[PDB]
Design a binder for these strands. Structure first.
Lengths: 118, 149, 127, 76, 178
RNA sequence: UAAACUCCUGAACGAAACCCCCGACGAGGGGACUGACGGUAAUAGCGCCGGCCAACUCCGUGCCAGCAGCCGCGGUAAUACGGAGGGCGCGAGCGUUACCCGGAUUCACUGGGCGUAAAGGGCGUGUAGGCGGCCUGGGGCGUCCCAUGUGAA
RNA sequence: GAGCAAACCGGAUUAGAUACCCGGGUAGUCCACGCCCUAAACGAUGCGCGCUAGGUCUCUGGGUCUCCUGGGGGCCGAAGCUAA
């Protein structure tokens, strides 16, 4: 080109359609470990989104029981949070699964006393 | 009729043998609002001594910014006579006059000077290197000196 | 480079040293025209034609003050050879100091240009 | 409208190719850009205009495809 | 809006007559004095209150500010419209200013309820922009708070004759007028 | 009168259809009709309080469950997780997800740089191209001004 | 093709020694013709021009030659610049 073109800004979440939410199907209910010093088993899930048709990894909030996510449960991805990513904890997870909504297969953690239920 | 506003006071710490010891610096602007302004920076172990020291220093070294002043010939009511662009080092500052109600639209370094300057309404722009210290401030100061009218 | 830039630079450089006089530069019709405004605006004590080695030059009287940095603290070229800078009467620009423009009308200060209602390359700004 | 140009080519029948040159301010850049275009102009007598003439072309109804101009007259 | 108004007036700690009413901040330190805020605090806090006062949506509010911002002169008052520009110009506001209603909300309902007139034509649009030289009369069928209004003085920019229960927007009131 | 306390001015306009005259189809003046409901105190706030950034204590939890914009926080004293109390700011909406522009002068013109941080080409010769000393005269292409047309809604 | 010396062949040192030390030694190092085209190819600083205190040593030319003036190489330093 006349001048080299630099890479521009990229959107944080490509839920495609710039949509607020996208629904996908769980491929696998994996568990990833944190980075930096923190350690634990963060519960995550690969999801096949309809919109992008993209496959993504999403965080599953709440202590949950075991959690209510299985091999092929329908789920909604919020991108909850600005990015919806958990950078400090787990790289590669762009979105959060909304179970607060309790929409789809993701059930809400029951009887959660604390306010984060919201 | 010397208004006295204080730009700000900083703690300015220093380290010496096994020990930190701070002094205070106060920047004080003094002006008639009729065309005379002075800036003085004085330091002292205590904030008050510093401010008073600065005020006295500011009183010395006064400069005739051409804004409005006491009813006589008029400067520009809280605004500048004309647009000037000044480059100091990599820093370039641009000042453009504005009508009343515009406000002082500028980045902080430029703003802080223009306000004590007595300018109420201006449109500004910092371009090039924006080291506030390095030359944005110096650049602003030169820009002000340059103004005629 | 640019003759005009050279002149502004020479004065800028000389003032820093605080030279009373300065061969601002070899004389040119345009350069002298510029100096005349510099005089009227009060930036320089004045200038004079001088003969150096049978070549015409313009001595520029520097004019300084007691308080601090030179009377002409600023002086920066704007339009430059790589990119010319032309401005409409609309955006002459304003600052506390003046800008010297060159118009078909002649070289005028920003205020003067406004009066004439003319535009032109913006040679430089001083204040 | 009316344009002025030179007859670059006599070769065709009843037609002449006139090369009009134009300068103008470009709306975006405002740079003064110059470009020229060739227009086929209708020449009925086929003796009217010879190569080298400067002529004024005038907007006309379509005579032929890719021809919307008639030789108004000879400038020279 | 139509949410708990009272708490907002407190906490903004600025007098807000969401009703005509009292200033003290609701919680933790109603008593303690809080004073001049920083520019930053001022900017955000200013937004919510300037808006909250009018009880208007951000969408409407934004347009008004943008216009006042472009025009030269201090944005704040020009924006403010004591009668000056925009904000107090709204018909709903004027009725409040006129004393027809005790509060801005009440005025809003009056205007919506149709108990208001402008130029005799009845207008129930609170967003209605009142221009200078318009009369804001109280609907014939209605008539009430005018009493008690008798002693109260009115902005120089406006005026009202208690008898007709009419009033006029004389001119755009300056912030000083505010 | 603020409080304490007692009770609840009055939501539950909607109507313009089926204008004329003077005055600028405006303001104003004169010459359209029509409401059963018809008088009750009568839905709610949301975000945040580790630093940036205004707002801190107890309890629960124990690298878990979770938070997270960045730096980061949680492995038995956590102002960073959940609740509570308290606090700061200002919910007929509020918050999330997706996508576009912004911040990004990060495809730095405004407005950045290259001794050692990323960055001088191993050096020269020279093509295209970019740039060009002093004085006078012609032209008026750039440049500036005026008028006019266009710049729909 | 004298000397030197990757690889290689030996000696020693070492826990091991595919190394450093010692004895040998081929390519190569030299010449010609052609090719390769790299580098801490470094001032880690592209070229030209103008302007902005001086001091000191030095190479080369001119001068009225105990110093001035021109070109070049170093050191110290005004103003200024720089994150230092």
């Amino acid at each position: 080109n006349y001048k080299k073109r630099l890479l521009g800004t990229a959107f944080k979440s490509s839920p495609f359609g710039g949509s607020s939410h996208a629904k996908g199907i769980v491929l696998e209910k994996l568990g990833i470990e944190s980075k930096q010093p923190n350690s634990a088993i963060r519960k995550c899930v690969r999801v096949q989104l309809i919109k992008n048709g993209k496959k993504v990894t999403a965080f599953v909030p709440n202590d949950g029981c075991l959690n209510f996510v299985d091999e092929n449960d329908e789920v909604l991805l919020a991108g909850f949070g600005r990015k919806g990513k958990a950078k400090g904890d787990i790289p590669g997870v762009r979105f959060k699964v909304v179970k607060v909504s309790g929409v789809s297969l993701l059930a809400l953690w029951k009887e959660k006393k604390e306010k984060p239920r919201s | 009729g010397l208004q006295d506003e204080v730009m700000n006071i900083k703690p300015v710490q220093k380290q010496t043998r096994a020990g930190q010891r701070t002094r205070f610096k106060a920047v004080v602007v003094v002006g008639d609002s009729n065309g005379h302004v002075g800036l003085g920076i004085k330091t002292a172990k205590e904030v008050a001594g510093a401010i008073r020291a600065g005020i006295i220093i500011a009183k010395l070294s006064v400069i005739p910014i051409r804004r409005g002043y006491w009813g006589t010939n008029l400067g520009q009511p809280h605004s500048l006579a004309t647009k000037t662009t000044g480059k100091c080092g990599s820093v370039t500052v641009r000042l453009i006059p504005a009508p009343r109600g515009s406000g002082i639209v500028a980045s902080p370094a430029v703003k802080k000077l223009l306000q004590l300057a007595g300018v109420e309404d201006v449109y500004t722009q910092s371009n090039g290197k924006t080291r506030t210290l390095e030359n944005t401030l110096k650049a602003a100061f030169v820009a002000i000196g340059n103004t005629y009218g | 480079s640019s003759v005009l830039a050279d002149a502004l630079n020479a004065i800028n450089n000389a003032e820093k040293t605080g030279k009373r006089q300065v061969l601002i530069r070899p004389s040119s019709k345009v350069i002298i025209k510029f100096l005349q405004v510099m005089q009227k605006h009060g930036y320089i004590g004045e200038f004079e034609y001088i003969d150096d080695h049978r070549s015409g030059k313009i001595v520029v009287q520097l004019n300084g003050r007691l308080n601090k940095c030179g009377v002409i603290s600023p002086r920066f070229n704007v339009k430059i050879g790589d990119i010319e800078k032309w401005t409409a009467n609309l955006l002459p620009a304003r600052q506390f100091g003046y800008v010297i423009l060159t118009t078909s009308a002649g070289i005028m200060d920003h205020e003067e240009a406004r009066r004439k209602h003319v535009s032109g390359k913006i040679l430089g700004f001083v204040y | 409208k009316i344009l002025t140009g030179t007859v670059v080519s006599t070769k065709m029948h009843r037609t002449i190719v006139i090369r009009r040159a134009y300068l103008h301010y470009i709306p975006k850049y405002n740079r003064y850009e110059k470009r020229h275009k060739n227009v086929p102009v209708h020449v009925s007598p086929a003796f009217r205009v010879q190569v080298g003439d400067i002529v004024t072309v005038g907007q006309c109804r379509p005579i032929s495809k890719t021809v919307r101009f008639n030789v108004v007259k000879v400038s020279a | 809006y139509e949410s708990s108004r009272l708490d907002a007036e407190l906490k903004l700690a600025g007098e807000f007559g969401l009703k005509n009413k009292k200033e003290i901040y609701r919680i933790s330190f109603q008593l303690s004095k809080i004073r001049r805020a920083a520019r930053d605090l001022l900017t955000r806090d200013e937004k919510d209150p300037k808006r909250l006062f009018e009880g208007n949506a951000l969408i409407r509010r934004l347009v008004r500010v943008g216009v006042l911002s472009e025009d030269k002169k201090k944005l704040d008052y020009v924006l403010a419209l004591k009668v000056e520009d925009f904000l107090e110009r709204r018909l709903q506001t004027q009725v409040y200013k006129l004393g027809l209603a005790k509060s801005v909300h009440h005025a809003r309902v009056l205007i919506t309820q149709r108990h208001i007139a402008v130029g005799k034509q009845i207008v129930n649009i609170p967003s209605f922009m009142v221009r200078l030289d318009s009369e804001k009369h109280i609907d014939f069928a209605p008539t009430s708070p005018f009493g008690g209004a008798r002693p109260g003085r009115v902005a120089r920019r406006n005026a009202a004759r208690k008898a007709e229960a009419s009033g006029e927007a004389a001119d755009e009131a300056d912030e000083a007028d505010e």
